[PDB]
Symmetry: D2
């Protein structure tokens, strides 16, 4: 019974000097070759266990789910200061949210998404096939879904309030560091920056908490059970400053997710620009199953292997969350013939699975074959886990994947796509590059 | 026996919603007004104790030094994984470095010689408008080089530049408000220091190099004449590799960088207030005259200039929050309780601007550090280097760099800029700017 | 969310000054009246949560079994010193023993108890109805069972080796303390005496181990699989797939048998006080088993009264009034209080066995407790002399079978008498030493 | 490099409990020392404990690193989650207070040291009067010694000694030394080890004690009486000292102190019992002592504390008695406070530690004949008292006996005064006195006769 093997560390720095010039990911890969699927690396004085390949990540997150579900120290409340019960309250809250998101699936996403998909088309027609940067377009459409689900009705793309919160929630801003400043941090035991809060993207923060209040007010007055129209009055029901903020927090979480959805699309479309023959096939399957006279609907995905396989492939290659979200072991645990002590930090390196050779004939090339059998139907591939697995698997998986199928097909149904750059010359290597694309009505 | 009071937190966010639009500092200040000199705020789910004003910070860092000296979780080794002894080795190593830095206090001469080189470079400027940023990084850095490798680099030496590049290479990481709220909810930050890549070529070239210098040193080294910090390394080694040095080197640079900025800020300040620069140039002529380089012993006979430099460090306030510490033992502080392992901010800024110690906390004012007769006077609020068990290891070097570099410059040149003094905006890190050095 | 209420403590002593003159149990009871079913008391500087009444104990040990299953600090290994894996090894070992004991129940255990039951009768016949102290007799019979189960064959009552180990395992010996010596201990944080501390603890044992070695040898020297004949070669098999483990296991088995023996001793005295009950039982015996065959386990089903009586005996006897203290594993929410991980907890078994909400007359001998109107056995939730939950007695099966068979077989072949008239028997947790006479019914 | 103290490998549940000498835990520690050295790690149950052997090792720990090795056992550590801090701290200050008060008894101006000396002197006197009234009868000094040492504590706490047969005295002599035993089988113990919980626990016994409720009452009476009559700045005894800290929980706090004090007195009493038996076996030593007594104190005044200075032999002898007696062989276990570096090993905060006092009192590097009675241990060539570092029957460091002062003064005075006025004899001939204890480190029971020297 030993700890997962790893490279020996240096004081202050840990293994920070043995990383590939190529990046932390390459490092983890070369490390795997030497030490295997489970190993121990050091960021500063702290050890972390790295999990590589499908099988290893699955065993951990799935087979021993309770053991591997813990959050990072920043998220753990100190009873000595807050006492328990806030611990537990949070507990019940989580379960509640977790429960509500299943209900959403069981005018649900399918219809709301079908609506938004329409609006998108109309906007794309009004583009009159102009070259543009889809970034704002995709953020808007994925976001609206969240809005319809939370406040009850989509915003108009140019609605002040919408923009103000599209602004708040995706406002970029960067913090700056020198190599020296960092080594020092490592030596302090404290990072320079911490979250909180927007500076000029905080301008609207004041307005958005405020907007929430208003919507809750309106909602409250017309509220009726057992007729909960959207998430707000669901809140109001569990209920029946702090409340407005509690909402925010959910809202924020939801947006953190939508942003990934949006990027998954952006990446997907660029990818399709590089590979028009695929886009063609998909347009074909579309015409063969949905035809030309009705909107695509969620039930169609079943009868459209290629397109699904293609979307799967997009999530796979895209790999937007390569490291997964780090967890924290809950109980001293026996894993793959090693030991992992309660409170060890752990990386399920999702990327190492999405590119796992034992599961993907060509881990680095775009290849729908990954998800198709001889007969050409969708086939399960265990390496496909872009949403993670286990107790903490994405709360948004359902909504997101439905967003991806519908937004994707509806678009390819009504338009074809082109760019200045010739397919041969599209560089897929990165977040996906900003680019220009043109939507042409069919 | 209670915990330090504070604003009630929200789930996930903590007190992150009750901060002033104006910034974390303003918040801490308004908070002080309401809860007092010691209070408790929440970043995420985690509590942190904030320390405000001279008296409070001093009590903590100085009076209860052992209690308030702990480092952040990132810096704490886990025995279950590494075992103890590496804990202890580090321990002894620290004491060693701590001991060596007192021995260093040489420095005086090396600085003086660098001071000279600076002057010659400033002459060659032929009074051209420039951005002193690179100049100051170079001069302060060389000191560290002379102290570690044994001899200054030439300002344009490839190796120098390559490491001036490694150690100050800026690079930024980017975050959305949403990405952040999510981090808070994960318990994990997106970015960890140094994980980033990486100037890999440069770090690698140096690592290779230190090797070289150690080699050379090894072959020619001897006692009781250990020339520079490398041998001292070689000696502690021979008494019982390239990587430890690097780490020290980095630490040293992290510091030098602050020294450089303290100068940059100082000079801009003097551009806004030429009548002060005049006085200083006067005291310089009255005490050091015009025919010898300023020397450390001069500071004693030059109150004004000292007071001014003090005032510069005060206003500059480059480390407003101090470096967060970690309580070591359950402790009784100012009639509250602080549990072992509580994170703590000694908000240095709150002292450097403490009204109980500075007649005009927010205006440049050398009177802060002068009595009626006009001699240097101790001001307890002056704590830019922190205080206590972990007070700056570089305090000595740094302050010596500041006095010499400052005076020598003002001795041989006067300064001017496009922007008229009335129009210099001191509000921020100090703005990038242009300045001209004119020989006297 | 608060901690369980309780009396305020004093420095060093805790609540040790507020105990009834009557004993710790009375205290817990008076405490219950004031603070309720869950409260917090202090032994020295250390808090402990006390659990009172059936419902409370059950909720804890049963409903939240994983939460309330932790052992005392003495039993918790320090990884810094021993590393994990020994932690885990122990873990798997436990499960193993736990598994083997269910198998024992699945040549068999019942027969082994029946054969011993016979031997008991023959010894009781050879008593020629002499007044004696059944203490040694009962320790012997219950012990043999363990020996048949472990080494494969009963010892003869006067076999040297038997006696030598009957001696080791039940050898009494006492340690002595002054009130002052104790207050001081409380102030040191350390007790004067430690289990296993004694010189004799060691001496008895070395001799014990040697016999084991031999039996393992023999057993080792002759087994075939799955021709395994008892616990030894079961050991040998898990090994092939030492004496030290066997010994520990055996000691725990004896720790238990000792309770079984006392349960009998108490039972018989009780019956001396209440001959009209003994009569009934002798009657049911004749009505169901008759006079010409030994009682058998299957008979208990068709003998409500007798079962009810044995239940009543365990209930009143209350040999483990405080239960075996446990240690909360996870921060927990219990009965609208909070209990922090690592809190020590008493499930005061006695408070259930005497719970008014479940026993018409908690303090008088009353088989009615376990019978319905029609006179069949009825479940009573308060009956938990073996504890409940993840750590419920490993020996429950064997013990209860020992109790039914030993009891009935005896009362079938003999009747009982004493000098003292039932009116005078003293109930006065150990049962008084006494004299009893077994008279054949021929 | 940096490693934990070495030791024998443990077994599940049992730890090292199977590798102990048949001879007893002490012999074990000794044989273990031979193999692993002065600092090693043994396992009681699943718990590790660090064992400290020999003078040098114990001294380095308790003395050189005193703050590091001063921690109490888990039973004595308050949980903040339940009690909050401050009770932690209050206790702290309380301790210091008691610690301060005990020095005030010993030094050395005002009430100070002499008042205490006088009390022992008086209670010593009665011992003589009582011994005269024995008319040289064979008796068991156990109760006599418990009484005399106890009274000191009473004079110090309540302000005046108790008549030896005074009901209240007896009642509390009874409470505080009342023996009572709990019983265990080998199996019941193995099980405990497996539970993580011991069967018994201090005070958890109902019997302790009927008198407990009544004494407690006594204190109230005494505190009451004291309260009305007391006055600073002359504070007569510990009660009004309490009253003063109060005026600046009532009996409970006193009771606890009282108990602690008695726990100690009991050791003092045994030290005497042992001492006297020892002298019965070695009458030629008793003669010498009686001689020094006559040569320094003469025959016409009571011995006084200042005499010890001028009486090397007798002192050396008493030292030797404490040494051989070894009433607290294991010392009182402590608890490491801070992760520590000790003798080139590592000891983690919260490790339990035994400073095996016996291993020092019998340390060959300090005692020519560790196992024989030998005053030479504490004398130089010239025959004066010489310091012996191995002599630490009171422990050392931050937590060294609070009673060292009183106790040692009790031992010198009680001892000499007695040997001054009587000589001693027993049925058993010296050759035949067996000094080895009985199942316990406690001295074997015995009969002795005090004969006046008139
Ligand atoms: C479209 C592509 C998306 C991907 C690949 C993605 C991926 C993930 C991943 C990797 C996690 C980590 C689970 C873990 O911590 O183990 C996650 C969790 C989560 N996802 Fe998403 N996300 C996406 C979009 C969304 C969306 C649209 C939502 C909208 C609700 C969302 C909500 C969440 C939330 C709230 C969690 C938290 C996990 C937890 O319960 O602790 N994500 N998602
Ligand atoms: C220019 C003015 C400088 C200022 C105002 C400054 C300020 C500080 C402050 C406030 C700390 C707080 C330490 C703590 O309590 O955590 C610190 C630490 C430190 N400083 Fe500087 N510094 C300066 C220049 C330098 C230089 C040139 C060096 C060269 C080596 C240096 C080396 C260090 C080191 C090694 C520490 C480590 C603290 C520890 O041991 O925990 N500093 N400094
Ligand atoms: C009337 C007879 C017995 C009674 C009343 C009894 C009662 C108990 C009780 C109350 C416990 C504590 C469960 C807990 O930890 O909460 C226990 C545990 C145990 N008993 Fe018995 N016992 C009896 C006989 C036996 C016998 C014959 C064995 C033989 C194996 C035995 C073996 C054990 C063992 C090995 C445990 C360990 C508890 C655990 O694994 O958590 N007991 N028993
Ligand atoms: C006659 C021989 C005595 C011996 C050998 C003795 C020995 C000890 C020892 C070994 C300790 C443990 C200290 C430690 O943890 O290192 C101790 C503690 C103590 N003893 Fe004594 N004692 C004696 C008599 C007394 C007497 C008469 C008193 C009367 C007050 C006394 C009061 C105490 C007290 C109050 C402590 C508290 C220890 C602590 O503060 O942690 N002892 N004693
Ligand atoms: C550390 C912490 C968080 C993350 C992170 C990963 C994915 C996302 C986007 N997202 C949100 C919900 N599902 C996916 C945000 C943050 C990565 C490293
Ligand atoms: C959090 C992390 C690092 C720090 C820190 C502050 C100042 C400095 C500059 N410095 C380093 C040594 N002397 C000055 C580096 C890092 C503060 C908060
Ligand atoms: C604390 C420690 C041990 C015990 C204990 C409980 C039961 C027994 C007898 N026993 C053990 C297993 N089955 C019955 C011995 C000790 C109780 C409280
Ligand atoms: C473990 C726990 C307590 C003890 C103990 C030692 C000495 C005493 C008596 N005593 C009182 C003052 N000095 C010693 C009581 C208990 C020893 C080992």
């Amino acid at each position: 019974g030993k700890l997962p093997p790893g490279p020996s560390p240096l004081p202050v720095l840990g293994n920070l000097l043995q990383m590939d010039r190529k990046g932390l990911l390459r490092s983890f890969l070369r490390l795997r070759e030497k030490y295997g699927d489970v190993f121990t690396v050091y960021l500063g004085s702290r050890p972390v266990v790295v999990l590589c390949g499908t099988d290893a990540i699955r065993e951990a997150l799935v087979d021993q789910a309770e053991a591997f579900s813990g959050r990072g120290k920043i998220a753990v409340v100190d009873p000595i200061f807050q006492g328990y019960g806030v611990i537990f309250a949070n507990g019940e809250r989580w379960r509640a949210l977790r429960r509500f998101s299943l209900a959403t699936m069981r005018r649900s996403v399918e219809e709301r998404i079908q609506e938004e998909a329409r609006c998108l088309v109309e906007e794309l027609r009004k583009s009159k096939g102009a070259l543009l940067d889809n970034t704002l377009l995709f953020h808007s459409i994925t976001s609206n879904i969240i809005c319809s689900i939370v406040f009850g009705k989509r915003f108009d793309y140019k609605d002040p309030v919408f923009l103000r919160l599209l602004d708040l929630f995706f406002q970029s801003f960067s913090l700056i560091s020198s190599f020296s400043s960092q080594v020092f941090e490592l030596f302090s035991g404290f990072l320079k920056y911490f979250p909180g809060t927007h500076r000029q993207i905080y301008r609207n923060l004041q307005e958005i908490n405020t907007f929430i209040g208003q919507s809750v007010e309106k909602h409250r007055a017309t509220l009726d059970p057992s007729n909960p129209r959207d998430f707000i009055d669901v809140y109001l029901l569990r209920m029946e400053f702090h409340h407005q903020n509690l909402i925010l927090t959910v809202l924020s979480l939801f947006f953190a997710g939508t942003e990934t959805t949006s990027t998954t699309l952006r990446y997907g479309f660029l990818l399709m620009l590089k590979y028009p023959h695929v886009t063609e096939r998909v347009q074909k399957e579309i015409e063969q199953v949905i035809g030309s006279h009705r909107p695509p609907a969620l039930d169609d995905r079943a009868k459209m292997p290629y397109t699904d396989a293609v979307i799967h492939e997009i999530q796979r290659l895209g790999d937007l969350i390569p490291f997964g979200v780090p967890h924290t072991v809950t109980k001293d645990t026996q894993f793959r013939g090693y030991v992992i002590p309660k409170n060890t930090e752990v990386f399920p390196v999702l990327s190492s699975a999405l590119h796992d050779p034992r599961y993907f004939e060509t881990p680095n090339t775009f290849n729908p074959g990954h998800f198709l059998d001889a007969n050409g139907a969708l086939k399960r591939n265990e390496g496909f886990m872009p949403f993670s697995l286990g107790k903490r698997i994405c709360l948004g998986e359902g909504i997101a994947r439905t967003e991806l199928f519908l937004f994707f097909t509806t678009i390819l149904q009504n338009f074809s796509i082109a760019s200045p750059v010739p397919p041969e010359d599209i560089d897929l290597t990165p977040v996906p590059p900003s680019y220009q694309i043109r939507f042409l009505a069919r």
